[PDB]
Design a protein around this ligand. Structure first.
Ligand SMILES: CCCCCCCCCCCC(=O)SCCNC(=O)CCNC(=O)[C@H](O)C(C)(C)COP(=O)(O)O
Ligand code: SF4
Ligand code: SF4
Lengths: 112, 181, 165, 385, 140, 87, 80, 54
């Protein structure tokens, strides 16, 4: 229930990472019915989205940073489930459902 | 029970490792403690016969971006038994969790939720720690000095989606900062 | 305790006696005169200090009082005032733009206090509801129109209030 | 246990009140308030304002007790500046603080009565409120957000004849309270709705940071006007009513008696009102008169500075609290030597009181929840800021 | 000698055997404090005021005089303080916060900036004589 | 007649397809005895993913202490083919 | 005839009985007072020239202060 | 100027703030006797009216 103490070491922190991954990913069928995503995106694509967010932070070595990231992850998850703000092609922070990149930016504006 | 007695009595009776700084002034007696001793010090002040600090008035954060521990958590406390007020402070950074005092003062519950919402300071053993003031799904802690006054997003009704939606801000007239220094 | 005092409360409960006074006092104001104001034929009282619709004033010669000092703009707690200025063709220091967002304004009167020449004032008018948001973005010409319309009342209030500020 | 979601989006109960109740039949097991619906970022906004520009924000925290929060902010600024306030301003500030207390209690008592089905007292009370709002307007030009109490004193002096009009109000107001009491006090329905409802023990009140009527209902003699007096409160006679049961019925009686004692203070303030200046004379934070600004170079320079840059406050920090109508209203002000506050934390009594709804409403009926909210006297402007 | 009908404090029950309870609590406190090191200021302070209150409770057999001489609220309130002090003693044994660390450093600031007379200020008044007796005992 | 378990061969098949479809799993090393970490090149985050992919396909939640004794295809098939909550 | 559908105007006509005409403005609005003490001695009102389509904004500035008890000067005395 | 709003010489007249009592109301026995006598006499009248109706 309560906010746990900071994880002592990386084994403790990574153990907490897997519980968050399990809890966040287990709630995909609830999210699918809440946002009516049956004809929009497959459950696996949102599972791979969560895994990708976790992998993008695999380089963090401070257990206290990991604890804060998990806590913010639980809060992001809770707001998505409990108080849904349904857009069309996003949930929360994540989008759902011959020239280099300089000319495209150049044609758009002067601020890159 | 004036501020002279509390300052002198506390120095004699308190464990020495609990207090790093003690200030006596007409702006309020003030003990600066370390993070790991905050809970025990407040329990001492509440239970001890000669202090009887029974009321937690409020808990507030202050941002000091120039410090390696930017946040200062201020506890304002009152003793109705002796008609005196005391201030206890401690420092924290963006990743250091600190002890919750809900078990000592039930009123701390919402105030600790506000500190987390406004500043991003987390509280060990807090029974229900979530944002309390901001909109659901809010990103950032607005009372931080680096957080912009108008924030990052605004809301409006979008007829094609038939709902209220959030978009990045676009001001007709930007906030004008007047430098009178 | 006592058969009389037991009988006393038993009858008071059964006969709802304390609810009789409640009915009696509810009926006394029934035949009394009412305090309702017959708006808009009758109006509520106001003071010369009342903070209402803004107005820009002129001297009796027709010259604007405002000299673009921008004190009102700096003090305005809501940042509701926007001013642009330059030297006029005759050398005068005058505004070319004076805007008050009546939807940002909090009707505090700080602008009136800050003005050193009594140019901007909050007038006595409070009946200026509009059907569009746009009409509440007052420009300089609108504010000078308000001052022309309300000058005789504003000057009278300023004379009465001069002994206090 | 089913969950009954109750948000009255109308000022039947506060307008933005939102409650998630867990019920066993008609009995409440858990009441969880959801707040922030009026969170406007006041504390963040204040950091971008000069000390003068931040003053109107305090009118809009507890928008039924406007001048009381004006007073607390001015006292905190005066504390940091070590500014002497003249005696006439102190009496005026206390006089309008007590007028504000009556204005607040009149709304709190009759909106609560209206919520439990007594519709007449609200109309009788709001007429008395209109007479008192007229005094607000005559001194400041505004019915509610006066911004009249300022650091160093008050904005302007009383208009001629105001004191006589206030005295006329005091000569009849006791009868108005008597009428309010006769409609409520002895009535068996009113007692049945309030007696033994929302009982708070003294230990519970201290544990949850209760203050004001919420604390004195539980028998605790605590009033900041006597515990930590300010302005001319130590030269005035008034009694402090305390409860013996800690229930909604006690707190109703206390608010009636506090209105009677507020009338007592106003009468004394009217008779003891001395002549003299109503602004502090240190030419650092007090605006000059219109006549001197237009005649003296030094006064014009001071006027230019005060309305553009404002005054600076030497770097320090303190907590200042007053006895607001709803309880202890506190301001934790941090200054860094500049003309803008570095941090302004607002301590709202309703924040603590509404947090106590869960233990206060335990095992009561659904219809008692509104009664307990009414006895707490919540205004969400101060709760949310 | 008359039994107390109410304390006037909501939730504070009347304790009719108050003197007996205080004597038991004070005797228990004076025995559990010995687990604290002798030189510790907390141990001396607790012993100082517990002994005096115990002496007053033993001498006076009437609870009205116990309240009068001690001057610290009602006996029921005195009991709450005695119970809380026993609870605090046990927690300090568990915490073991005693002893000064090696590189101990404490900064004392005495800011003498005055404040105006009219701003809110707590002025409780003089404490009972025993509070000042405990303080000068601690200093010496 | 009513059954209370999924057929073992049918499970072996469902588990074989789930493990193969998971990317980074070439349908060449996926034998009924193949181990996730030692023989498939899947790390801890990829290994927990496979186990909950078995939860989605079979529509039931695996207690964690069982989710850990599923390090290979036998251990997973041994578990799902004997769990009644599997559908 | 306007009294039958417009009860707001009827209240003014009833209360006009026995009142003193104070002045008339440039739009034709008529100003009346009673000199009594019923709502705390406040007995000032205006009978608008247009019996239909009357509006509070039709009161000119010189009579606005008198009508709202801001000043005791009538519109005629302010114009002089 | 030198004239400020304040009390008159001698101050204003004293004002009451305490609640005023009011002794209005009949007595337990008076209203009981009235009801009992009305009941007895009225039921006798009911009997008489029933006899005439018959
Ligand atoms: C529906 C969406 C709601 C939920 C929102 C999701 C929010 C997610 C963002 C917060 C979660 C994090 O990033 S939490 C940060 C996670 N990163 C770490 O744990 C750093 C240490 N790295 C490792 O342990 C390994 O590299 C690792 C590959 C992870 C596994 O170990 P293996 O090498 O032994 O497989
Ligand atoms: S009244 Fe106040 S908010 Fe409005 S323009 Fe003037 S200073 Fe700004
Ligand atoms: S209105 Fe007054 S304060 Fe504002 S710019 Fe003009 S002269 Fe200056």
């Amino acid at each position: 229930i309560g906010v746990p103490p900071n994880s002592a070491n990386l084994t403790e922190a990574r153990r907490r990472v897997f519980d968050f991954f399990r809890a966040a990913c287990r709630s995909i069928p609830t999210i699918m019915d809440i946002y009516n995503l049956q004809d929009v995106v497959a459950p696996s694509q949102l599972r791979y989205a969560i895994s990708a967010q976790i992998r993008n932070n695999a380089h963090i070595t401070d257990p206290k940073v990991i604890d804060l990231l998990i806590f913010k992850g639980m809060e992001e998850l809770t707001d998505i489930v409990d108080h849904a703000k349904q857009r069309h092609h996003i949930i929360g922070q994540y989008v759902v459902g011959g020239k280099t990149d300089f000319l495209k930016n150049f044609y758009t504006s002067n601020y890159f | 029970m004036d501020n002279q007695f509390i300052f002198k009595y506390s120095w004699e009776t308190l464990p020495k490792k609990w207090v790093k700084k003690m200030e006596r002034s007409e702006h309020g007696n003030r003990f600066d403690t370390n993070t790991d001793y905050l809970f025990q010090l407040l329990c001492f002040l509440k239970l001890h016969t000669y202090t009887r600090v029974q009321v937690l008035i409020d808990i507030c954060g202050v941002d000091y971006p120039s410090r390696k521990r930017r946040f200062e958590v201020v506890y304002n406390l009152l003793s109705t038994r002796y008609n005196s007020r005391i201030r206890v402070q401690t420092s924290a950074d963006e990743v250091t969790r600190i002890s919750s005092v809900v078990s000592l003062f039930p009123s701390a519950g919402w105030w600790e939720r506000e500190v987390w919402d406004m500043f991003g300071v987390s509280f060990i053993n807090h029974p229900d720690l979530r944002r309390i003031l901001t909109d659901y799904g809010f990103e950032g802690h607005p009372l931080r000095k680096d957080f912009p006054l108008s924030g990052y997003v605004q809301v409006r009704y979008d007829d094609p989606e038939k709902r209220v939606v959030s978009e990045p801000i676009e001001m007709t007239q930007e906030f004008r900062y007047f430098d009178f220094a | 305790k006592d058969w009389n005092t037991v009988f006393e409360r038993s009858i008071n409960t059964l006969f709802l006696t304390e609810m009789v006074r409640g009915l009696s006092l509810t009926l006394k104001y029934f035949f009394d005169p009412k305090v309702t104001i017959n708006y808009p034929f009758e109006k509520g009282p106001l003071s010369p200090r009342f903070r209402g619709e803004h107005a820009l004033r002129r001297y009796p010669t027709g010259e604007e009082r405002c000299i673009a000092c921008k004190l009102c703009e700096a003090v305005c707690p809501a940042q509701a005032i926007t001013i642009e200025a330059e030297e006029r063709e005759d050398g005068s220091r005058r505004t070319t733009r004076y805007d008050i967002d009546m939807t940002k304004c909090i009707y505090c009167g700080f602008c009136q206090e800050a003005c050193p020449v009594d140019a901007i004032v909050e007038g006595p008018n409070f009946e200026f509801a509009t059907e569009t948001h746009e009409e509440l973005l007052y420009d300089k010409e609108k504010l000078l129109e308000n001052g022309d319309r309300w000058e005789t009342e504003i000057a009278e209030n300023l004379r009465s209030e001069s002994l206090y500020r | 246990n089913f969950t009954l979601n109750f948000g009255p989006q109308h000022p039947a109960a506060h307008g933005v009140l939102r409650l998630v109740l867990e019920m066993n039949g008609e009995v409440v097991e858990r009441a969880e308030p959801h707040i922030g619906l009026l969170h406007r970022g006041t504390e963040k906004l204040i950091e971008y304002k000069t000390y003068l520009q931040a003053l109107p924000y305090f009118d809009r925290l507890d928008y039924v007790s406007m001048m009381a929060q004006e007073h607390a902010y001015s006292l905190a600024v005066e504390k940091l500046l070590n500014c002497e306030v003249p005696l006439r301003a102190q009496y005026i500030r206390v006089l309008f603080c007590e007028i504000t207390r009556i204005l607040n209690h009149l709304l709190a008592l009759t909106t609560h009565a209206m919520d439990v089905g007594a519709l007449t007292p609200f109309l009788w009370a709001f007429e008395e409120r209109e007479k008192l709002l007229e005094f607000y307007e005559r001194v400041s030009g505004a019915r509610m957000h006066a911004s009249f109490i300022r650091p160093g004193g008050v904005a302007q002096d009383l208009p001629l004849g105001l004191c006589r009009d206030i005295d006329s109000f005091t000569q009849q107001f006791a009868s108005r309270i008597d009428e309010l009491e006769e409609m409520l006090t002895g009535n068996r329905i009113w007692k049945q709705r309030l007696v033994d409802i929302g009982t708070v023990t003294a230990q519970q009140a201290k544990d949850w940071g209760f203050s004001g009527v919420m604390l004195r209902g539980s028998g605790v003699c605590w009033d900041l006007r006597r515990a930590a007096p300010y302005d001319v409160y130590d030269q005035l006679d008034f009694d402090v009513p305390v409860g013996t049961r800690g229930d909604c019925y006690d707190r109703y009686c206390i608010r009636i008696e506090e209105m009677r004692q507020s009338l007592r203070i106003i009468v004394q303030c009217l008779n003891q009102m001395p002549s003299g200046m109503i602004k502090a004379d240190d030419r650092k934070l007090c605006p000059p008169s219109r006549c001197r600004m237009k005649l003296s170079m030094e006064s014009l320079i001071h006027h230019f500075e005060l309305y553009t840059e404002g005054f600076s406050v030497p770097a320090s920090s303190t907590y200042t609290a007053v006895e607001a109508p709803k309880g202890e209203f506190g301001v934790f002000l941090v200054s860094n030597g500049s003309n803008r506050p570095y941090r302004c934390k607002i301590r709202a009594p309703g924040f603590a009181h509404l947090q106590g709804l869960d233990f206060m409403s335990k095992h009561h009926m659904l219809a008692d929840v509104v009664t307990i909210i009414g006895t707490q006297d919540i205004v969400f402007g101060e709760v949310d800021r | 000698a008359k039994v107390k009908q109410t304390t006037g404090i909501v939730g504070l029950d009347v304790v009719p055997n108050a003197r007996a309870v205080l004597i038991d609590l004070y005797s228990k406190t004076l025995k559990e404090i010995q687990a604290v090191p002798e030189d510790e200021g907390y141990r001396k302070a607790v012993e100082s005021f517990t002994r005096q209150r115990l002496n007053v409770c033993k001498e006076e057999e009437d609870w009205e005089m116990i309240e009068k001489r001690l001057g610290c609220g009602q006996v029921e309130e005195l009991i709450e303080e005695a119970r809380d002090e026993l609870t605090l003693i046990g927690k300090m044994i568990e915490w073991d916060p005693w002893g000064v660390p090696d590189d101990y450093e404490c900064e004392v600031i005495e800011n003498d900036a005055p404040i105006p007379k009219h701003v809110p200020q707590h002025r409780p008044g003089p404490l009972p004589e025993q509070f000042y007796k405990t303080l000068e005992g601690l200093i010496a | 007649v009513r059954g209370s378990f999924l057929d073992k061969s049918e499970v072996t098949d469902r588990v074989l397809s789930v493990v193969k479809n998971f990317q980074k799993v070439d349908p060449s090393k996926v034998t009924p005895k193949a181990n996730f970490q030692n023989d498939l090149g899947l790390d801890s985050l990829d290994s927990v993913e496979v186990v909950m992919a078995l939860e989605e396909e079979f529509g039931f939640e695996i207690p964690d202490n069982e989710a850990d004794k599923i390090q290979s295809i036998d251990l997973a098939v041994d578990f799902i083919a004997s769990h009644p909550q599997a559908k | 005839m306007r009294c039958l559908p417009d009860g707001n105007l009827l209240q003014t006509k009833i209360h006009n009985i026995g009142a003193t005409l104070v002045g008339v403005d440039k739009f034709g609005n008529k100003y009346y007072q009673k000199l009594g003490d019923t709502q705390y001695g406040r007995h000032r009102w205006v009978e608008y020239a247009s019996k239909d389509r009357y509006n509070a904004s039709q009161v000119p500035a010189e009579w606005h202060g008198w009508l709202h008890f801001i000043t005791d000067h009538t519109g005629d005395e302010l114009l002089s | 100027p030198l004239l400020q709003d304040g009390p008159p010489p001698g101050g204003f007249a004293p004002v009451r703030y305490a609640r005023r009592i009011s002794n209005t109301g009949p007595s337990a026995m008076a209203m009981f006797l009235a009801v009992s006598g009305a009941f007895a006499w009225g039921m006798y009248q009911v009997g008489q009216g029933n006899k005439i109706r018959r």
